[PDB]
Copies of this chain bind each other. A is one copy, B any other.
């Protein structure tokens, strides 16, 4: 437990779809596959403390599929809780683009378990960047029966909106006067962010007069909310600015 501290337990957190090659029956399915899964020991009808295949050969597998790429640090294997069935060695295969698949260690066997309940962790030689990952049992005791977990680095999710060409107008109010002067253009995002975004807001067109050879121009967001922000174009000192244009990039996390 300490050895995978701070990592995401994929199956525990229901972060992946699980597809199996075959299921012994309807109470031996991938619904029973989570590490340390335990069921009703007094009632036989809820089935096995494991996913168990129907066909017993070297062509079986369980696939965990994530739509968002992850960095897989480790796979834990465990035997069947309620009978002497466990997987003693297996192959790992994975895919990042879900078109081409690859074999970990070129398909060499990874060491599995030797009993019902003692978990055996395997940390991948190099962390594997993938969307989908599969356990392919190669050798077994009794039957192809397992519980398992995959451990990944935490993911971060961003949502970004770009908006183009926020403009002061021609011969705008920055083109007269002196001292600090601002022209404000309210901007509404196309959709409302779920959390407060950070906003980059940068020049794409500049039409301005120097003042004793000095250029002084700026643009900055103000009053950023989930819905929009005020685009503040500005100059200062004696500078006269005919126009300014900017594009923005707004990004919220998680």
Q: Does A76 contact B (CB under 8 A)?
A: no
Identify which of B29, B218, B242 contacts A206 (C-beta below 8 A): B218
Q: How many of chain A's residues have a CB under 8 angstroms from any CB in B?
A: 99
Give chain A interface residues in 205-238, CB to chain B under 8 Å: 205-210, 213-221
CA distance A153 to B164 in the complex (A): 26
Task: Please state if A40 and B55 are interface contacts (CB–CB under 8 Å).
Answer: yes
Q: Which of chain B's residues have a CB closer than 8 A to the CB of A129?
A: 194-195, 254
Task: Please state if B6 and A24 are interface contacts (CB–CB under 8 Å).
Answer: no
Task: Please state if A47 and B69 are interface contacts (CB–CB under 8 Å).
Answer: no
Give chain A interface residues in 1-51, CB to chain B under 8 Å: 6-20, 22-27, 29-31, 34, 39-40, 43, 45-47
21 contacts between A and B (CB under 8 A): A8-B99, A13-B63, A14-B18, A14-B132, A15-B67, A15-B132, A45-B54, A67-B67, A158-B158, A158-B159, A160-B249, A162-B197, A165-B220, A200-B247, A202-B246, A202-B247, A205-B217, A205-B218, A207-B215, A210-B210, A249-B249
Q: Apart from A8-B98, A19-B34, A23-B31, what are 18 other A-B pairs with CB-CB below 8 Å? A: A8-B97, A14-B132, A17-B17, A25-B45, A45-B54, A97-B154, A99-B154, A156-B159, A158-B158, A158-B159, A160-B162, A163-B200, A202-B247, A204-B246, A207-B214, A208-B214, A209-B213, A210-B215
